[PDB]
Design a protein around this ligand. Structure first.
Ligand SMILES: C[S@@+](CC[C@H](N)C(=O)[O-])C[C@H]1O[C@@H](n2cnc3c(N)ncnc32)[C@H](O)[C@@H]1O
Ligand SMILES: Cc1ccc(C(=O)O)c(NC(=O)Nc2ccc(Cl)cc2N)c1
Length: 256
């Protein structure tokens, strides 16, 4: 049994109160106060629609993924990744696809910088979408579950779906459950063919083992996954560490 399975078994044993104290212990988070207030008032400029904008910005600012040309955003939700890419200098067009409907987020219309090069489409299940030519492929799909075998199935499904969209392009793909031996086998095959590396985002909660497969980097997948497993296990040991607070992104206004 993997270090990740031991972390998941422990996570599943926590009371709601313990789970609530654990999930944000020692993580990094952006202060969403101003954006939440503005969005409640129906403000359409400056504010990121979700925490997703700051999450993708973390990778982009470290050159792990460099969005350019035609950006495809799979599982765009409210649109955090799409509106962030819309303001990047090398980006020319952003297309977002999301399921929507009961239990899922709907795209939020915004007037942030570069809103005019974005098209968000709801009622779209990516598992039935044929692949499209694109210069950047983004995918944030992976629903958490108390069952690691459910999470493993969801991860393999995403990995099999994304491959036909990968054609020597920039990419950032969520890997919900990267520690199961079957997932590691797929990721290593994918890394040999398309390159890139798996990276833990410090904005991720301790309640998820999610890592992101990004195009610009190299490294040992097994070592990186085991490093995250040891980190998350170690975070059960000590009393709650309040999260490190950072400033949220200002997405500005205007067209391009
Ligand atoms: C983690 S959220 C996306 C957050 C987004 N990156 C942002 O910055 O706002 C993942 C999204 O994928 C959507 N989703 C899940 N399964 C889907 C599917 N089969 N096809 C399309 N969208 C799906 C969910 O509704 C959810 O809004
Ligand atoms: C459990 C959960 C949490 C968060 C959200 C959210 O949007 O932030 C969410 N959304 C929805 O359930 N949306 C929804 C509900 C009914 C119908 Cl007819 C259409 C939609 N789209 C669901």
């Amino acid at each position: 049994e993997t270090l990740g399975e031991k972390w998941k078994k422990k996570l599943n044993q926590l009371s709601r109160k313990e789970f609530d104290l654990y999930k944000k212990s020692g993580i990094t988070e952006v202060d969403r106060t101003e954006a939440k207030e503005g969005l409640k008032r129906g403000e359409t400029t400056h504010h990121a629609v979700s925490r997703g904008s700051a999450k993708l910005q973390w990778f982009v600012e470290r050159n792990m993924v460099i969005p350019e040309g035609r950006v495809i955003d799979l599982g765009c939700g409210r649109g955090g990744w799409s509106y962030y890419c819309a303001g990047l200098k090398k980006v020319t067009e952003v297309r977002g696809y999301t399921k929507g409907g009961p239990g899922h987020e709907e795209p939020v219309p915004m007037s942030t910088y570069g809103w005019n090069i974005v098209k968000l489409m709801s009622g779209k299940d990516v598992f039935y979408l044929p692949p499209e030519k694109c210069d950047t492929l983004l995918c944030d799909i992976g629903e958490s579950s108390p069952s690691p075998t459910v999470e493993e199935s969801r991860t393999i499904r995403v990995l099999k779906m994304v491959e036909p969209w990968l054609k020597n392009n920039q990419f950032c793909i969520k890997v919900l459950n990267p520690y199961m031996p079957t997932v590691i086998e797929h990721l290593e095959r994918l890394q040999r063919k398309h390159g890139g590396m798996l990276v833990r985002n410090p904005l991720s909660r301790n309640s998820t083992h999610e890592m992101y497969w990004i195009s610009n980097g190299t490294g040992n997948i097994v070592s990186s996954v085991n490093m995250v497993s040891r980190l998350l296990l170690n975070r059960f040991t000590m009393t709650h560490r309040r999260p490190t607070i950072e400033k949220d992104v200002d997405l500005g206004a205007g067209t391009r």
